[PDB]
DNA sequence: AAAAAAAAAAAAAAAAAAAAAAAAAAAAAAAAAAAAAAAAAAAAAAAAAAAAAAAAAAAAAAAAAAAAAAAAAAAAAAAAAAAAAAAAAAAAAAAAAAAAAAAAAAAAAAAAAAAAAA
């Protein structure tokens, strides 16, 4: 649900691309901190296969 | 009383900055090992000193590698043009001590007010 409750948002996208390994990520939480480098799409798909 | 400049209304153009949260790097300032350097002790190889000696400069003189002369030929270096690197000369500057103008505390004394006595 939305913050107002008037609409709805997806909880997670039904992806076909491994977006986390491919595009990477970077963020600063309060206790944690993520830093994932990007990867090549063909190699990651080969690993998935 | 004339001139000039600020400011404010509302639709337009275009910008700038402070913090949180984790993880890694980069400056920049300290204790603290670690070795030069220096003062002040005892200690010990070198100059002195002397007598005694024999190894290499003189001297004779031949001769054999030599330095000047002659020639031919190759082409390194010097001076004149330009084009870059790198350092004193001179002038400028931002904090920084000096001076001057405005805010807060001070009481002396009185106007107005509030309150109560007989």
Curated annotation (Swiss-Prot):
Domain of life assignment: Bacteria
Record's subcellular location: Cytoplasm
Purpose of the protein: A type II topoisomerase that negatively supercoils closed circular double-stranded (ds) DNA in an ATP-dependent manner to maintain chromosomes in an underwound state. This makes better substrates for topoisomerase IV (ParC and ParE) which is the main enzyme that unlinks newly replicated chromosomes in E.coli. Gyrase catalyzes the interconversion of other topological isomers of dsDNA rings, including catenanes. Relaxes negatively supercoiled DNA in an ATP-independent manner.
Family listed: Belongs to the type II topoisomerase GyrA/ParC subunit family.
Other facts noted in the record for this chain: When the enzyme transiently cleaves DNA a phosphotyrosine bond is formed between GyrA and DNA. In the presence of quinolones this intermediate can be trapped and is used as an indicator of drug toxicity. The enzyme-DNA intermediate is also the target of a number of topoisomerase poisons, including toxin CcdB.
Note on domains (UniProt): An N-terminal fragment (residues 1-523) can be reconstituted with GyrB, but the complex no longer has negative supercoiling or ATP-independent DNA relaxation activities, although it is capable of DNA cleavage; ATP-dependent relaxation is inhibited by novobiocin and non-hydrolyzable ATP analogs. The fragment has ATP-dependent DNA relaxation and 30-fold improved decatenation activities, unlike holoenzyme it preferentially binds supercoiled DNA. The C-terminal domain (CTD, approximately residues 535-841) contains 6 tandemly repeated subdomains known as blades, each of which is composed of a 4-stranded antiparallel beta-sheet. The blades form a circular-shaped beta-pinwheel fold arranged in a spiral around a screw axis, to which DNA probably binds, inducing strong positive superhelicity (about 0.8 links/protein).
Quaternary structure note: Heterotetramer, composed of two GyrA and two GyrB chains. In the heterotetramer, GyrA contains the active site tyrosine that forms a transient covalent intermediate with the DNA, while GyrB binds cofactors and catalyzes ATP hydrolysis. Can form a 2:2 complex with toxin CcdB in which GyrA is inactive; rejuvenation of GyrA(2)CcdB(2) is effected by CcdA.
Protein name: DNA gyrase subunit A
Parent sequence residues shown: 147 to 195 of 875
